[PDB]
Paper text:
In [name], mycolic acids are subject to specific chemical modifications introduced by a set of eight S-adenosylmethionine dependent methyltransferases. Among these, [name] ([name]) is responsible for the introduction of oxygenated modifications. Among these, [name]/[name] is particularly interesting, as it has been shown that it is necessary and sufficient for the introduction of oxygenated modifications on MAs and that oxygenated MAs participate in the virulence of Mtb in mice, modulate IL12 production in macrophages, and trigger the differentiation of macrophages into foamy macrophages in granulomas in vitro. Crystallographic screening of a library of fragments allowed the identification of seven ligands of [name].
Numbering used by the authors: 19 to 301
The structure:
Amino acid sequence: EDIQAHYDVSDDFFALFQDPTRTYSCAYFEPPELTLEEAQYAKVDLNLDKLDLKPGMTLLDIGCGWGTTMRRAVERFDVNVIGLTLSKNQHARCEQVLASIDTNRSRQVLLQGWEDFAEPVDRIVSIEAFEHFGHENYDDFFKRCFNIMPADGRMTVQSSVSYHPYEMAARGKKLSFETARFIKFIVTEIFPGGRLPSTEMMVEHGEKAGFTVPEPLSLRPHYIKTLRIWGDTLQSNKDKAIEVTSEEVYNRYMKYLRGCEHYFTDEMLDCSLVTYLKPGAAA
Ligand SMILES: c1ccc(CC2NCCN2)cc1
Ligand SMILES: [Mg+2]
Ligand SMILES: [Mg+2]
């Protein structure tokens, strides 16, 4: 706990490498010449367009960040929204983002985890929160998501993934041990207590809960471009980043950002956008 708190970093530091929306997830460069900011909106659209959202439905955002996904959903689809975050800062910002919207739709932000959320919702989106949940909680997660949705329910989960050690060993022993050590660094120093799933885990746990799971979308090339821009931006802001934190924290995040770009490029990490369809989902 204390040792993990050593890895707490100011929101101000994150602002020195992210786009103006402060999206801390894979952008979607379609078309390829989008700015990072436009690509973060495109990634939100990529997720929401999979969810068969109709006016007056309620969308649940599990890990709602700074509220960008929820705002886009209200504005584009005329839906009610509920977001879950455990960040007090993100909670306050989401309430202000949603209050700003010209709408009669209900907007709610809860400072709580999915474990404590048991209200009926139409559709669920979760963008790069899943890596915090832990393997032993995946069955409870998919069961909760299945049970709170109607017969035509759908969910997207976007998550960074690694491969089963067996599969990693297939793509060179030297690279398997080197990748495992970097993943340990990610889930120790960058996201304390994190644990990467595999795409196969994300699929099989959904199926066991009763979801239909089509072929997941790989975002690998998009995450490479995202991490290149994040790294280039942090580096261009080096002095300011050291002033707000320390040389230690700057070096840690340069290692994270360049490191991830490398292991994504070498196809030892991936990013999967998995769609989960309830049996009564529209065709
Ligand atoms: C391990 C734990 C959490 C995460 C989620 C995440 N947050 C920002 C970008 N990825 C990834 C990997
Ligand atoms: Mg902000
Ligand atoms: Mg490297």
